[PDB]
Amino acid sequence: ANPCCSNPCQNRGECMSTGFDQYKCDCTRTGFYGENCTTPEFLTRIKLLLKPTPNTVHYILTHFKGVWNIVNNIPFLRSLIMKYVLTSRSYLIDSPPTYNVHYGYKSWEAFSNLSYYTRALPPVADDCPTPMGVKGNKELPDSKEVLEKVLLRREFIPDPQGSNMMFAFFAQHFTHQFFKTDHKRGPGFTRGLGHGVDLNHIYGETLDRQHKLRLFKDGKLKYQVIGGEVYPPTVKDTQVEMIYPPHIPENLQFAVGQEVFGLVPGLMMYATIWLREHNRVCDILKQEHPEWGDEQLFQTSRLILIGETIKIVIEDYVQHLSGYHFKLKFDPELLFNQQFQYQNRIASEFNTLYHWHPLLPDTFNIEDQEYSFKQFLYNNSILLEHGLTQFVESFTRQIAGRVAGGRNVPIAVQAVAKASIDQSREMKYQSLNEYRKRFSLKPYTSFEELTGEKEMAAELKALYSDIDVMELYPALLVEKPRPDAIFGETMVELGAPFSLKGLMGNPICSPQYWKPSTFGGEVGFKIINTASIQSLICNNVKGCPFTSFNVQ
Amino acid sequence: ANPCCSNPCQNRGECMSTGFDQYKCDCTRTGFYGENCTTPEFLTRIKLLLKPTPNTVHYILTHFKGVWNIVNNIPFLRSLIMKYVLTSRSYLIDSPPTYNVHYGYKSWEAFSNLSYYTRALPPVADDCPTPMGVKGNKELPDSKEVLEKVLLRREFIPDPQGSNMMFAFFAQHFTHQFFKTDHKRGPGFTRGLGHGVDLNHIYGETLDRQHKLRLFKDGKLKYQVIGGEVYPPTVKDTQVEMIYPPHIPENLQFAVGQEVFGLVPGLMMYATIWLREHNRVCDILKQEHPEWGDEQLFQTSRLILIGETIKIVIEDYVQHLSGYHFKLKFDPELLFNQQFQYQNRIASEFNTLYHWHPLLPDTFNIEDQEYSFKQFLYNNSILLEHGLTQFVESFTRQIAGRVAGGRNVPIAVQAVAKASIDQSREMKYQSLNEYRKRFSLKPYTSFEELTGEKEMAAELKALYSDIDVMELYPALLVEKPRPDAIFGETMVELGAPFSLKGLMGNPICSPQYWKPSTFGGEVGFKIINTASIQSLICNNVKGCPFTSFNVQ
Numbered sequence A, B: 001a002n003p004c005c006s007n008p009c010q011n012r013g014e015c016m017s018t019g020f021d022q023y024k025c026d027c028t029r030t031g032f033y034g035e036n037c038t039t040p041e042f043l044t045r046i047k048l049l050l051k052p053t054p055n056t057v058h059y060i061l062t063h064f065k066g067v068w069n070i071v072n073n074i075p076f077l078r079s080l081i082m083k084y085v086l087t088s089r090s091y092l093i094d095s096p097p098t099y100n101v102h103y104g105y106k107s108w109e110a111f112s113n114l115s116y117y118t119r120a121l122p123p124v125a126d127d128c129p130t131p132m133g134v135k136g137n138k139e140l141p142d143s144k145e146v147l148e149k150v151l152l153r154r155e156f157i158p159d160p161q162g163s164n165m166m167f168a169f170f171a172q173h174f175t176h177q178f179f180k181t182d183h184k185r186g187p188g189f190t191r192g193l194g195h196g197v198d199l200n201h202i203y204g205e206t207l208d209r210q211h212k213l214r215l216f217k218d219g220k221l222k223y224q225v226i227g228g229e230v231y232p233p234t235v236k237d238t239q240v241e242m243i244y245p246p247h248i249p250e251n252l253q254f255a256v257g258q259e260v261f262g263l264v265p266g267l268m269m270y271a272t273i274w275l276r277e278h279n280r281v282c283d284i285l286k287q288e289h290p291e292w293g294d295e296q297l298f299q300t301s302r303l304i305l306i307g308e309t310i311k312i313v314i315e316d317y318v319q320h321l322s323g324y325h326f327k328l329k330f331d332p333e334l335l336f337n338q339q340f341q342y343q344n345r346i347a348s349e350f351n352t353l354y355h356w357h358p359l360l361p362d363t364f365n366i367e368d369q370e371y372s373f374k375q376f377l378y379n380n381s382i383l384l385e386h387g388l389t390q391f392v393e394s395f396t397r398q399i400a401g402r403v404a405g406g407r408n409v410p411i412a413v414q415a416v417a418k419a420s421i422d423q424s425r426e427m428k429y430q431s432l433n434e435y436r437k438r439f440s441l442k443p444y445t446s447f448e449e450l451t452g453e454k455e456m457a458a459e460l461k462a463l464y465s466d467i468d469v470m471e472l473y474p475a476l477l478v479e480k481p482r483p484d485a486i487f488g489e490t491m492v493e494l495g496a497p498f499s500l501k502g503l504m505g506n507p508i509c510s511p512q513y514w515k516p517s518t519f520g521g522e523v524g525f526k527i528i529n530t531a532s533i534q535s536l537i538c539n540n541v542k543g544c545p546f547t548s549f550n551v552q
């Protein structure tokens, strides 16, 4: 009955119901006027012409290696590019945040409640005639049918980009500090009240948890030594709550920041590496500041590890992910003369677009072995078995699956995929073309254009009927990958804004924070500005094994 | 001890201890370089020369009333100015926030814990030799001696500016939504987790409290009708907790947003006026939006009242306070092409500088009466006695005390003043000249320059000895008032930045929020853009009693 159910306003214009069956579009600052915000203004038309498509830019960012090789070695030229990357993106995010799963109109409740994941697009009204508004049938296609016909993997499809397991598990370990759905409340709720890279997955969300994990001497994190190796402490010794099946022996129940990282040895691998790093830097700091106490050493280390993480995520992780020939740069100063909000609010859609389960292989091969999911889950004996060096070497060698090709979701994890579909419908998500339009992308006109092939398209067309009814989540895993790329345009176009906003949006990147003193001086500052996923492994893993985010 | 105990780093430089007996200053982006960041850079020296003192600017703004009359009628000219007052100020605030009562160095704990009041200047180290660092004696002068010698009022000193009781109580009611010290934790802790004008003093901090106060029909707030007049509901009917002495009759225990507003009829006066306004606007909104439900009407109303509040505080309240001939303007758009952080963190110092108790008279005269403090406190029968119209008329006529003259703190409220002194020492505050320097002011060279007279100066000099040991809080109440002004330069220079930051820092002022649709259309937007203390008291109190913030 909601007259705005039809998503009338185009170009970021706000729909407001003016009477029981009439509406109105607020075209303020949209660049257009007209009942529906579609009549462009003069200056708008000019910017529309000189605007290259995302796929055009991606092409230039990934081609002409010889050229990028030049730009890449011209400090001022290289800064000029990155600054444009960092800004051109950010304007797509609403900050301060707007809607959430319960509010399709701006309200204080929405803006102030930190328990909610924010929303790029308002949910579909509850009194709308169809799930996606007015188009389609009273009900979306069976999620199980969608799951089986185009999502479940028959044969393992490797990633053309070379993404290995150090990459897959890094993304998992990292994204899991801000993606912590509060299942007790609902899918649109989060437990990561920091809404970003606060490294609570190492230190804990609560002060109470943080103090249980702390040694309280030299600012160090409690740990244990097994077979001459440093690993996280046990739950029996720290009292911090972790999620472990009832059959796990107390001496294997490791206690880390994130209560769920004990369920996957790959997550516990990074957990140990970052614990080792925290205390490593603690020694560096005490060395320079013999006058410093335990609290100030611990606090400053955490600030440094946050900076190292932002550094690695932008120069290693995303660097590999993007496939750009342009060398990304983590330099908060590039935004200092720009208009930018040093704040963030984790989006639900970002969380949805990040369910990269197709990444996982059919077996985890560490050294001589080949473990099935059943054997890998909650099994830290495996880690204690081969050791961090073996894990790093083995996972650096194992290729991970492609994400956007289609039909590559491991069957061992199909429940997770079904739920992604279901919960998205539960949170009244808007269609894939609604989100495409929202992120300055051209809506797909057919299922064949979306997939780039004929079979899955046929399958989808028989399930949904309208391409304008197609759902976001599945569409992302089935989208036509970019040339030899792991992702489609929608994945990269939605994820980059949300990503940089939370990476650059961090307080430590603000002017008052970006300076030596904040990190204990030029020695601490340097740790950050020189961080690499390689030096992260080298300094903490025995044998300084070689590591990379791609199958060498 | 610390070696940084003596505040060596000048010009906002950061002191970081570099060894048991050595220190260093991070002069990053300060404009100065040198072991103590005192050596100005070139451009710095040019800017200095071309920067008029706070007292110069003040003078220009409170004079040339003819010029001001012109500018004030040249839309773009006025805009030009106000934008300058908006921006020129804001750069003095650290945002995102930095220190708190427990952290003198930036830490994540400091930046993430919302339970703390932030701090404009780091507290003095606990291992410092003296209370203010290195200067002065092991102990500051007796607070009771300070209290009695220069703070307690012998004869009531009226405010030369004409401030009446509608002003004094307005400031109290308003400032009490973000100044809510959590005494269970300590002075440096707050309960106003919104850190700004979120109008929790009307709606409640918690959703639980908010729902107890809500009618749940037309988005209205519960209320009661007494003698044909609308008043807040009772605690017996809503179950919301309020602070009332044991002898107050249930039928007098009014339930409002702020649990403490039942302790002063002046506070409960504004409480009723703003409750009346919320439902008033609810009627306006239902009129335009028959299709809207209770939740959307209530939520939109609250967004409108927040806007009205920001409008009135800047164009009525501050307008009167400043004494400027320049007409202030509340227009979030003036910052749209500027670099500004749409966020805030209530400062402890702001809270301290706002203890305007000298404002209160010796008796509250409503109509024929003259009530002593003893009779006025927690007495809502008085309100029910004379009514809102009588309170508005009476309080608009009664002059309020001067704040900066010296010796004008009502004796009926001396405990409050003593504590302000104590708690400030408790939170390890820095000296008055430290804060003056921090806010681009020139430190006072003598107690006579601070007070502008000889007696109180002599009294203070005998108590503190060094002007560089002089405490902030007392200094504010004893400072030489500006010509016929209610405040001194330190008061206006510290408060303005903290003030606009939280007023302009509100989300509703952000681009995504500043548009008709957010406020239910052009009708709701208009309510905000044409708000004033006159129309507030005019659409809500019987007879539309004339009202103003100054004695007519």
Ligand code: HEM
Pocket (backbone or CB within 6 Å): A168, A169, A171, A172, A175, A179, A180, A181, A264, A266, A351, A354, A355, A356, A357, A359, A360, A413, A416, A419, A420, A423
């Ligand atoms: C080691 C294999 C993995 C297992 C056993 C696993 C299992 C799961 C399960 C059971 C959930 C809950 C899903 C739901 O109910 O909605 C989940 C959520 C999630 N997984 Fe995985 N996952 C694995 C690897 C990954 C990887 C490598 C990524 C991609 C970077 C990933 C990203 C996500 C995301 C973003 C969520 C939601 C996080 C949250 O809100 O709590 N997962 N996964």
Ligand code: HEM
Pocket (backbone or CB within 6 Å): B168, B169, B171, B172, B175, B179, B180, B181, B182, B264, B266, B351, B354, B355, B356, B357, B359, B360, B413, B415, B416, B419, B420
């Ligand atoms: C109507 C008579 C008033 C009484 C009986 C009164 C009483 C008090 C009391 C007992 C406190 C706690 C003091 C402490 O121990 O720190 C307080 C705090 C305060 N008062 Fe008043 N006051 C009155 C009027 C005002 C007015 C007119 C203002 C002017 C803005 C004002 C501003 C403050 C401030 C800013 C605080 C701090 C609140 C907090 O941090 O939680 N008061 N007052």
Ligand SMILES: *[C@@H]1O[C@H](CO)[C@@H](O[C@@H]2O[C@H](CO)[C@@H](O[C@@H]3O[C@H](CO)[C@@H](O)[C@H](O)[C@H]3NC(C)=O)[C@H](O)[C@H]2NC(C)=O)[C@H](O)[C@H]1NC(C)=O
Pocket (backbone or CB within 6 Å): A113, A114, A115, A116, A184, A185, A186, B206, B207, B208
């Ligand atoms: C952010 O929004 C959340 C979602 O609404 C809020 O969580 C809900 O808070 C309600 C009020 O506290 C809870 O209501 C229940 O109502 C019954 C009947 O009045 C009470 O008896 C219950 O005690 C009360 N709580 C529970 C657990 O039943 C909701 O249950 C609760 N959870 C959900 C999923 O809605 C958050 O409170 C809010 N956060 C803040 C800071 O306001």
Ligand SMILES: *[C@@H]1O[C@H](CO)[C@@H](O[C@@H]2O[C@H](CO)[C@@H](O[C@@H]3O[C@H](CO)[C@@H](O)[C@H](O)[C@H]3NC(C)=O)[C@H](O)[C@H]2NC(C)=O)[C@H](O)[C@H]1NC(C)=O
Pocket (backbone or CB within 6 Å): A206, A207, A208, B113, B114, B115, B116, B184, B185, B186
């Ligand atoms: C913001 O900072 C506040 C001040 O540090 C935190 O409040 C403190 O949290 C502590 C840990 O929860 C409490 O410590 C007490 O320690 C004993 C010994 O371990 C425990 O048994 C107690 O249960 C625990 N709490 C109490 C009430 O005894 C402090 O008491 C508590 N209060 C103060 C004034 O320090 C806030 O938790 C923190 N906020 C967030 C969101 O992290």
Ligand SMILES: CCCCCCCCO[C@@H]1O[C@H](CO)[C@@H](O)[C@H](O)[C@H]1O
Pocket (backbone or CB within 6 Å): B148, B149, B152, B153, B154, B155, B411, B414
């Ligand atoms: C009539 C007003 C006289 C003001 C001068 C006060 C000088 C210090 O006088 C103080 O006054 C306080 C208020 O009663 C008392 O509680 C103190 O005991 C008293 O020392």
Ligand SMILES: O=C(O)Cc1ccccc1Nc1c(Cl)cccc1Cl
Pocket (backbone or CB within 6 Å): A318, A321, A322, A491, A492, A493, A494, A495, A496, A499, A500
């Ligand atoms: O940066 C991340 O958090 C990973 C990620 C996930 C989804 C989409 C994009 C990205 N990263 C990313 C970024 Cl941040 C910029 C440009 C291109 C890419 Cl693919």
Ligand SMILES: O=C(O)Cc1ccccc1Nc1c(Cl)cccc1Cl
Pocket (backbone or CB within 6 Å): B318, B321, B322, B491, B492, B493, B494, B495, B496, B497, B499, B500
């Ligand atoms: O604006 C307030 O909240 C009151 C207040 C208190 C202390 C200091 C300044 C102000 N207001 C104020 C402001 Cl916000 C700007 C310019 C001039 C003045 Cl006096």
Ligand SMILES: *[C@@H]1O[C@H](CO)[C@@H](O)[C@H](O)[C@H]1NC(C)=O
Pocket (backbone or CB within 6 Å): A006, A007, A008, A009, A035, A036
């Ligand atoms: C927008 O386009 C026209 C009005 O210009 C009208 O036909 C249409 O219904 C409007 N909205 C939608 C969703 O079509």
Ligand SMILES: *[C@@H]1O[C@H](CO)[C@@H](O)[C@H](O)[C@H]1NC(C)=O
Pocket (backbone or CB within 6 Å): A374, A375, A376, A379, A381, A382, A385
């Ligand atoms: C766990 O790992 C150990 C050692 O690698 C292995 O022997 C055991 O079978 C595994 N347990 C399960 C349930 O897979």
Ligand SMILES: *[C@@H]1O[C@H](CO)[C@@H](O)[C@H](O)[C@H]1NC(C)=O
Pocket (backbone or CB within 6 Å): B006, B007, B008, B009, B034, B035, B036
């Ligand atoms: C700053 O002034 C000089 C160094 O330029 C030195 O004598 C002094 O100790 C420094 N610090 C302070 C607090 O004076």
Ligand SMILES: *[C@@H]1O[C@H](CO)[C@@H](O)[C@H](O)[C@H]1NC(C)=O
Pocket (backbone or CB within 6 Å): B374, B375, B376, B379, B381, B382, B385
């Ligand atoms: C409260 O107010 C009433 C009515 O105005 C007055 O008669 C009474 O004396 C007051 N009570 C106290 C304790 O002051």
